[PDB]
Write a protein that binds this ligand. Structure first.
Ligand SMILES: *[C@@H]1O[C@H](CO)[C@@H](O[C@@H]2O[C@H](CO)[C@@H](O)[C@H](O)[C@H]2NC(C)=O)[C@H](O)[C@H]1NC(C)=O
Ligand SMILES: *[C@@H]1O[C@H](CO)[C@@H](O[C@@H]2O[C@H](CO)[C@@H](O)[C@H](O)[C@H]2NC(C)=O)[C@H](O)[C@H]1NC(C)=O
Ligand SMILES: *[C@@H]1O[C@H](CO)[C@@H](O)[C@H](O)[C@H]1NC(C)=O
Ligand SMILES: *[C@@H]1O[C@H](CO)[C@@H](O)[C@H](O)[C@H]1NC(C)=O
Ligand SMILES: *[C@@H]1O[C@H](CO)[C@@H](O)[C@H](O)[C@H]1NC(C)=O
Ligand SMILES: *[C@@H]1O[C@H](CO)[C@@H](O)[C@H](O)[C@H]1NC(C)=O
Ligand SMILES: *[C@@H]1O[C@H](CO)[C@@H](O)[C@H](O)[C@H]1NC(C)=O
Ligand SMILES: *[C@@H]1O[C@H](CO)[C@@H](O)[C@H](O)[C@H]1NC(C)=O
Ligand SMILES: *[C@@H]1O[C@H](CO)[C@@H](O)[C@H](O)[C@H]1NC(C)=O
Lengths: 50, 120, 361, 254, 50, 49
C-alpha cells in the first residue's frame, strides 16, 4: 500500500517538476526578451518597428 | 516522517536527487533572469536635486522620497495591483534593490542619454 | 558537501546538502472522557444469580467496557478465553457482548468449554467449537451455600438430545428412561429432569458452588459499539510533538488558537486541506497546529584549493530554533556579518551574499 | 390501541419549490474563508418537494418510500409534529426505529413494533392519548436525549442511512411566513449520529390530534429526497456555510 | 486489471501532453519570431543582416 | 463509458484536470500565436481598383 502511495506521489512530483521546467523555459524566454528590450529601448533608440 | 516509507523509497534510487536538482536549476535560473534584466549598469546614477528638464516631468516615474519603499508612484501602483516539504526560496534581489536598479537606469537615461549604455 | 557532490574537491559556491528537521520530542494522545461505562457491576456482583438451565443473558452494548478491572481482580479462580486474548480486550472493539450468568458445581467448571462433554455441556449450557470470548468463574461458598442446604439452584439431568450452542431449555417434561409410556406421570422409569444441588458448607473444593459469567462476542456488520477504555495522557503545548487527537494523528507544534469553532466542529483545515486547527476532546479548547520548522541545509564554502572553512545556511529557520546571523533567507552560522557592501560572490538570498577574505556575510 | 380516522376530506397532495434549502455540513471539519467542493447525498436546488397539510378536514399521514435519504422541513406552530416512523415493512416481522417526542422527553428505540395503520398522538383541551403502537417485542437499542424542538418556527431535518449510521442534521429557524417555504439559506448542523444498523425503506410522519370527534391542528410539512451530487460550499470568516452552488443545476453554476 | 490499464493509459496520456507542451513551446517561439519578422520586414525596412 | 473505470480513476486525483488544463492552454496559445502574427493592424486597407 505504501508502494502504491509512493509511486502515485512520485508521479505527481515528476509531473509538477516537468511542468515547472516548461514554465521555467517560457519565463526564461520572456526574461531574455525583457533583457533585450532593456538593452535596446531603454539604453538606446531602436529602429526596429514595433 | 515514516521511516518505512523512506526505506521503500530508497529502492527507487536517485529520483529525488533529480527532482531537487531540477528545482535548484529553476531557482537559480530565476535569479539569473532578474540579473540579466535589471543589472545592466554597474554605476548607480542619481538625478540632480533640481528637476529642471526643460518642462519635462518625470515625477510619476522617478522614486518618491516620501515613500519608505523608495518606489515611483507608477511602481507603487504596480506593486499594489499585484496580489509538506515545500519551501519558498527568497529572490536574490529584493524589491528595493530592483527599484534601485530601475532608478539608476532612469537617472542614466534622463541625465546622460544613451551614452551610459555604451560607456561613461 | 563532498559526500553530496560525490567529489573530493568542492568548487566555490553554495550547495544544498541536507534537510534540517525539528525532531518530535513527545507523543501526545488526547481521547475524550471515559463515560457511560458498561453495567458489569449488576452482572458479576448481582444479588441472586440464576440457575444453569435458565441462565440469565445480559446484552452489553452501547457502552465502553473496562476489562482491566475485571481481569486484575484476584477473586476469580478461572479466567479462560477461547477466541481472544485477555490483554487485548481493552484494545479490540466488538458490536455487542452476551453475558451468560449461572451457578454450577465446582467439578463442572471445566465443562463450560469448547469440545468438552458433560451433563452441563450437553443438557444445561453448550458452547460452540468456534467460540470467542472469555469464561470467568469464581468460588461462592460464602454466599450461595446454606447450612440447611441450598436447593434453589437446579440443573437439568436428562434430555433426549444434546443442546445446540446458546440454547435454553426451561421445560419440565418428564423424561422417559425406558420405553414405557409416560403421560407426565412419574413411575419406576420416569423421573423429573431438574434436580437440586447439594451446596453445603461442609463439602470440600469441587462440590462448592461456583458462579460463572460467560462473555460472548459478536462481530456482525453492525457498528462496534463496545470498545475498550482509552488512556489519555497530558497535553503539552508549544513544542514539536506527535499529536493523536481522536484518531487524527500527525506531527506539529500545538499552540493556542483564536479561531472560534462552532460546537459541532472538531478539526480545522486551510485552503490546501491540511489540518492546522483542532479541538482537544478532554477540554473543549481550540489549538492551532503549526508544522515543525523543517528547512534546507546549505553549505557555503570557497574552493577546497583555497580554504576548508565553511558556513551553514538553514533555510527558513529562525536562529533561536537551531558567528550566528539572522537573514530573511534563514539562519546563517559560521559567517561574520559586516556593515560593508561588496559585490556578490556566493549568493545567500534576500540581498545577502557571502565571500572569503574568514567567511563574511 | 388503534383508531381509524374516518372523517378526512379527500384531496391530492401538493408540491412546491425547495429553493436553496436542504444543505448540511458534510463533515466535522472547521473551514475558514475557503470554498469546498464535496461529493455526498445532497438535496437538489429548486427541486420538487412533496407538500402535506394538516388543517380543518386534512390529516396527511401516509407512508412514503425512504430512497437514499429524507429532507424534512416543518413550518410548525403549537407543536403538532412529534416524531417519525422508520422501518421497512412496519410490522412485527422486521425491526423498526421509533422517534417520539411526547410531553416530557425524546425517546429513541430500535425494536420490533406493531405499528397501527393510522398512528397518532392526542392533546385534550393536556396530552392523554397515545395510539402509535400495539406491541413491542424485541428491543436492541434505547436512547433518551434532550428535546429537539401563522407559522412561527421552521424545523429542518436530514435523515441518512449510510453504513449503519443514522445521521440527524437539524436547524431551527425563526420565520413569520404564512403558507409556503421561505426563500433563504440555512446550513443544517449535525446533531446526533445513531448506531441503528437496520434496513429502512419507508417512513411516516407522526402528528398530534386536538380533542375538545377529533380536530387537526394547523400544520404543514415538506418532504425532500437526497441525491448523490456535488456542492460548492462557501465558508465565511466565522466558518459557517453562507452560500452553496449546485454543480448539476444549470451551466452557470456548473 | 483496470488499475493496470488506467496506469498504462495515464502514463501514455501524460507522455503525449508533455510532448505537446514541448512542441507548443517550439511553435510559440517560431510564432514570436514570425511576429517579429512581420513587424520588422513587412511594416518597416530592417537594417538587420539576414 | 465504463463507470467502474472512472470510479477507480477518481482515486488518482486531479491528473485528468491537469492534462485538460494543459491542453486548453495550448489550444488558446495557438489562437494567441495567430492573433500576434497576423492581426497587427486594426484597419483593413484596400488597394485601388
Ligand atoms: C510634475 O508633475 C507632478 C504630478 O503631476 C506635479 O505635482 C502636482 O502639483 C500640483 C500643483 O503644485 C498639485 O496640485 C498636485 O497635487 C501635484 N501632484 C502630485 C502627484 O504631487 C508637479 O507640479 C509637476 N512639476 C514639477 C516641476 O514637479
Ligand atoms: C384501520 O384500518 C386499517 C385498514 O383497513 C385496518 O387494517 C386492516 O384490518 C383488517 C381487520 O380484519 C385486516 O383484516 C387487514 O389485514 C388490515 N389491513 C392490513 C393492510 O393489514 C385496521 O385494522 C383498522 N384499525 C382498527 C382498529 O380496526
Ligand atoms: C462487584 O463486581 C463489580 C464488577 O464491575 C465491581 O465493580 C465491584 O467493585 C464488585 N464489588 C466488590 C465489593 O468488590
Ligand atoms: C471531561 O473531563 C474533564 C477532566 O478535567 C472535565 O474537566 C470536563 O468537564 C469533562 N467533560 C467535558 C464535556 O469535557
Ligand atoms: C411536481 O410534481 C407534480 C406531480 O408529481 C407536478 O404536477 C408538478 O408540475 C411538479 N412541479 C414542478 C415545479 O415541476
Ligand atoms: C432492505 O429492504 C428492501 C425492501 O424491504 C429490500 O429490497 C432490500 O434488499 C433490503 N436490504 C437488505 C440489506 O436486506
Ligand atoms: C413519554 O414517554 C416515556 C417513554 O415511553 C414515558 O416514560 C413517559 O411517561 C411519557 N410521558 C408522558 C407524559 O406520558
Ligand atoms: C422476538 O420476539 C418473539 C416473540 O416475542 C420471540 O419468540 C423471539 O424469540 C424473539 N427473537 C429475538 C431474536 O429476540
Ligand atoms: C462574524 O462574527 C463577527 C463577530 O465576532 C461579526 O461581527 C461578523 O459580522 C460575522 N461575519 C459574518 C459574515 O457573519
Amino acid at each position: 500500500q505504501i508502494d502504491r502511495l509512493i509511486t502515485g506521489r512520485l508521479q505527481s512530483l515528476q509531473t509538477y517538476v516537468t511542468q515547472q521546467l516548461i514554465r521555467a523555459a517560457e519565463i526564461r524566454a520572456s526574461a531574455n526578451l525583457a533583457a533585450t528590450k532593456m538593452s535596446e529601448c531603454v539604453l538606446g533608440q531602436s529602429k526596429r518597428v514595433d | 516522517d515514516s521511516t518505512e516509507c523512506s526505506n521503500l523509497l530508497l529502492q527507487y534510487g536517485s529520483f529525488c536527487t533529480q527532482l531537487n536538482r531540477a528545482l535548484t536549476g529553476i531557482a537559480v535560473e530565476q535569479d539569473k533572469n532578474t540579473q540579466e534584466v535589471f543589472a545592466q549598469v554597474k554605476q548607480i546614477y542619481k538625478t540632480p536635486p533640481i528637476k529642471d528638464f526643460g518642462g519635462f516631468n518625470f515625477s510619476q516615474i522617478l522614486p518618491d522620497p516620501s515613500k519608505p519603499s523608495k518606489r515611483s508612484p507608477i511602481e507603487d501602483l504596480l506593486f499594489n495591483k499585484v496580489t509538506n516539504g515545500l519551501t519558498v526560496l527568497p529572490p536574490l534581489l529584493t524589491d528595493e534593490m530592483i527599484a534601485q536598479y530601475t532608478s539608476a537606469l532612469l537617472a542614466g537615461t534622463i541625465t546622460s542619454g544613451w551614452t551610459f549604455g555604451a560607456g561613461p | 558537501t563532498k559526500c553530496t557532490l560525490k567529489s573530493f574537491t568542492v568548487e566555490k559556491g553554495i550547495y544544498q546538502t541536507s534537510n534540517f528537521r525539528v525532531q518530535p520530542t513527545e507523543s501526545i494522545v488526547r481521547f475524550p472522557n471515559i463515560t457511560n461505562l458498561c453495567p458489569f457491576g449488576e452482572v458479576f456482583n448481582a444479588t441472586r444469580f440464576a440457575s444453569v438451565y435458565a441462565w440469565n443473558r445480559k446484552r452489553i452494548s452501547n457502552c465502553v467496557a473496562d476489562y482491566s478491572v475485571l481481569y486484575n481482580s484476584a477473586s476469580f479462580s478461572t479466567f479462560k478465553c477461547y477466541g481472544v486474548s485477555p490483554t487485548k480486550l481493552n484494545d479490540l472493539c466488538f458490536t455487542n457482548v452476551y453475558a451468560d450468568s449461572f451457578v454450577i458445581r465446582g467439578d463442572e467448571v471445566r465443562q463450560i468449554a469448547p469440545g468438552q462433554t458433560g451433563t452441563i455441556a450437553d443438557y444445561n449450557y453448550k458452547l460452540p467449537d468456534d467460540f470467542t470470548g472469555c469464561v470467568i468463574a469464581w468460588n461462592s461458598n460464602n454466599l450461595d451455600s446454606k447450612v440447611g442446604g441450598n436447593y434453589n439452584y437446579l440443573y437439568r439431568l436428562f434430555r433426549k438430545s444434546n443442546l445446540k450452542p446458546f440454547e435454553r431449555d426451561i421445560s419440565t417434561e418428564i423424561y422417559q428412561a425406558g420405553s414405557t409410556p409416560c403421560n407426565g406421570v412419574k413411575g419406576f422409569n420416569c423421573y423429573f429432569p431438574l434436580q437440586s444441588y447439594g451446596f453445603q458448607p461442609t463439602y470440600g473444593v469441587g462440590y462448592q458452588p461456583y458462579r460463572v459469567v460467560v462473555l460472548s462476542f459478536e462481530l456482525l456488520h453492525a457498528p462496534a459499539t463496545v470498545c475498550g477504555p482509552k488512556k489519555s495522557t497530558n497535553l503539552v503545548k508549544n513544542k514539536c510533538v506527535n499529536f493523536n487527537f481522536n484518531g487524527l494523528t500527525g506531527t506539529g507544534v500545538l499552540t493556542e488558537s483564536n479561531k472560534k469553532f462552532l460546537p459541532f466542529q472538531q478539526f480545522g483545515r486551510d485552503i490546501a486541506d491540511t489540518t492546522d486547527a483542532v479541538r482537544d476532546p478532554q477540554t473543549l479548547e481550540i489549538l492551532d497546529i503549526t508544522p515543525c520548522s523543517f528547512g534546507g541545509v546549505s553549505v557555503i564554502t570557497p574552493g577546497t584549493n583555497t580554504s576548508n572553512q565553511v558556513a551553514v545556511l538553514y533555510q527558513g529557520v529562525n536562529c533561536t530554533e537551531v558567528n550566528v546571523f539572522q537573514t530573511r533567507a534563514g539562519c546563517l552560522i559560521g559567517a561574520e556579518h559586516v556593515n560593508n557592501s561588496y559585490e556578490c560572490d556566493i549568493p545567500i538570498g534576500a540581498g545577502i551574499c557571502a565571500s572569503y577574505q574568514s567567511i563574511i556575510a | 390501541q388503534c383508531v381509524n380516522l374516518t372523517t378526512r376530506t379527500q384531496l391530492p397532495p401538493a408540491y412546491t419549490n425547495s429553493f436553496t434549502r436542504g444543505v448540511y455540513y458534510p463533515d466535522k471539519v472547521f473551514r475558514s474563508s475557503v470554498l469546498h467542493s464535496t461529493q455526498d447525498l445532497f438535496l437538489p436546488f429548486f427541486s420538487n418537494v412533496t407538500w402535506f397539510h394538516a388543517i380543518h378536514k386534512r390529516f396527511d399521514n401516509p407512508v412514503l418510500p425512504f430512497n437514499d435519504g429524507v429532507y424534512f422541513a416543518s413550518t410548525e406552530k403549537s407543536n403538532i409534529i412529534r416524531g417519525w416512523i422508520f422501518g421497512t415493512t412496519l410490522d412485527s416481522k422486521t425491526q423498526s426505529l421509533l422517534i417520539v417526542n411526547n410531553a416530557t422527553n425524546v425517546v429513541i428505540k430500535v425494536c420490533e413494533f406493531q405499528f397501527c395503520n393510522d398512528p397518532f398522538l392526542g392533546v385534550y383541551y393536556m396530552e392523554s392519548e397515545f395510539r402509535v403502537y400495539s406491541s413491542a417485542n424485541n428491543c436492541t437499542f434505547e436512547y433518551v436525549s434532550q428535546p429537539f424542538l401563522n407559522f412561527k418556527n421552521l424545523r429542518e431535518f436530514v435523515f441518512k442511512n449510510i453504513d449503519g449510521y443514522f445521521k440527524i442534521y437539524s436547524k431551527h429557524t425563526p420565520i413569520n411566513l404564512v403558507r409556503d417555504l421561505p426563500q433563504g439559506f440555512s446550513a443544517l448542523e449535525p446533531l446526533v449520529d445513531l448506531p441503528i444498523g437496520i434496513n429502512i425503506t419507508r417512513f411516516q410522519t407522526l402528528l398530534a390530534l386536538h380533542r375538545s370527534g377529533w380536530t387537526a391542528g394547523a400544520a404543514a410539512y415538506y418532504v425532500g429526497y437526497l441525491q448523490p451530487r456535488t456542492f460548492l460550499l462557501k465558508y465565511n470568516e466565522n466558518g459557517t456555510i453562507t452560500d452553496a452552488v449546485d454543480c448539476a443545476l444549470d451551466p452557470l453554476s456548473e
